[PDB]
Structure 1
């Protein structure tokens, strides 16, 4: 009984299948990001986090039979989602037009702070983050355009860009670095991600699947 979610007229299908991997994923949650200007929340993007179908069996061991309220306050639960042995697919769709460098600047900031935070920001991670930046330089995201982060459990982060919300056929780049590969999702649902919309969605939707 997995449903879809619409955010500012941007829809996130309940389930999806990738042309690049051939696996299928279910919508784990959705929400929105932006900037708070003069006390006002200014929306710029919508975010959807998908989990590989096999994430259920994996998470079932430790989190089956827990209330949504209980999962939401448990950090270890989100750590399993972030680093669990399955792919996570994040799709960010624009509400307001941002150039590749405009959008990527803040993402990279949050990722670098996290990486330095946990002591995993050496030359390799720096180089990987530069490659990350390099991939965004040639693109522009008008309203509706999307960015796809494919977090492979094998320590690789795949980057895709779409004129709209349909999954691209090929990936634009592969960031091969373990620490960086999970940094992006970390800044969305990790312990130091202020916005709880995504975290709450995960707590509210997962319990159902874990029980069957």
Structure 2
């Protein structure tokens, strides 16, 4: 259904619902957490991550996981696979805890995606082109402390990206990357076996367990 309570990550509030930029639908918060980004081996930067999906992911697509505890879901790789494969709209909201240039952020996440694609043997030139669109978008942006990125999977292969320096929710999506493998790999970056954020995965297992009841 629809979550009622916000989750706060390093002081940053994630609301229990969000309407993706340009969208009419409201997505429910599933969980939130943190990850680190390495800049030149001398700096580790932190981002806060919030994971949202259509309410329907609970009512329909994750019914087989009913009655499991959070502490039963977090170790089950099949559970997170079902989540990332669910045919529903999803949104990941990123807040910059301290500042990054667009190229700094974009480059780090691009490498996360590339590494996942190579592990799957799905890093050809269709994906290479898509990742350059991804890189080119982020190179133009600035992410001072408190800025936000909205990654919106509006379809299984359609990644809509929006940003705002003041943390406000944009009225429309700004860029779109259409590539099935890149879209799926970015979901894996956050929620897969090799996730950059065990804390987000644990929170999402808790939030889904609660919603399933």
Q: Following the alignment from structure 2 to structure 1, what is the Cα–Cα distance between the partners of residues 27 and 128?
A: 30
2:174 is the counterpart of 1:186: no
Match of 2:177, SS state, is strand
Q: Following the alignment from structure 2 to structure 1, what is the Cα–Cα distance between the partners of residues 109 and 121?
A: 19
Match of 1:47, SS state, is strand
Deviation at 1:41, TM superposition (A): 9.0
Structure 1, 193-202 or 120-129: larger mean CA deviation: 193-202
Match of 1:148, SS state, is strand
Query: Which residue of structure 1 aligns with residue 167 of structure 2?
Result: 165
Q: Following the alignment from structure 1 to structure 2, what is the Cα–Cα distance between the partners of residues 28 and 181?
A: 19
The answer to whether the Cα contact below 8 Å between 1:28 and 1:51 also exists between their aligned partners in 2 is: yes
Deviation at 1:85, TM superposition (A): 0.6
Matches within 5 A, 1:7-156: 7-35=9-37, 42-156=44-158
Structure 1, 51-60 or 20-29: larger mean CA deviation: 51-60
Cα RMSD between the aligned structures?
A: 2.0
| TM-score of the pair, normalised by structure 2 | 0.91
The answer to whether the Cα contact below 8 Å between 1:90 and 1:149 also exists between their aligned partners in 2 is: yes
Gaps of 5+ in 1: none
Q: Following the alignment from structure 1 to structure 2, what is the Cα–Cα distance between the partners of residues 124 and 82?
A: 22
- Runs of 4+ deviating beyond 6 Å: none
| TM-score of the pair, normalised by structure 1 | 0.92
Gaps of 5+ in 2: none
Q: Following the alignment from structure 1 to structure 2, what is the Cα–Cα distance between the partners of residues 27 and 191?
A: 21
Query: Which residue of structure 2 aligns with residue 2 of structure 1?
Result: 4
Deviation at 1:43, TM superposition (A): 4.2
Q: Following the alignment from structure 2 to structure 1, what is the Cα–Cα distance between the partners of residues 87 and 59?
A: 10
Count of aligned pairs between the two proteins: 210
Match of 1:73, SS state, is coil
Query: Which residue of structure 1 aligns with residue 205 of structure 2?
Result: 203
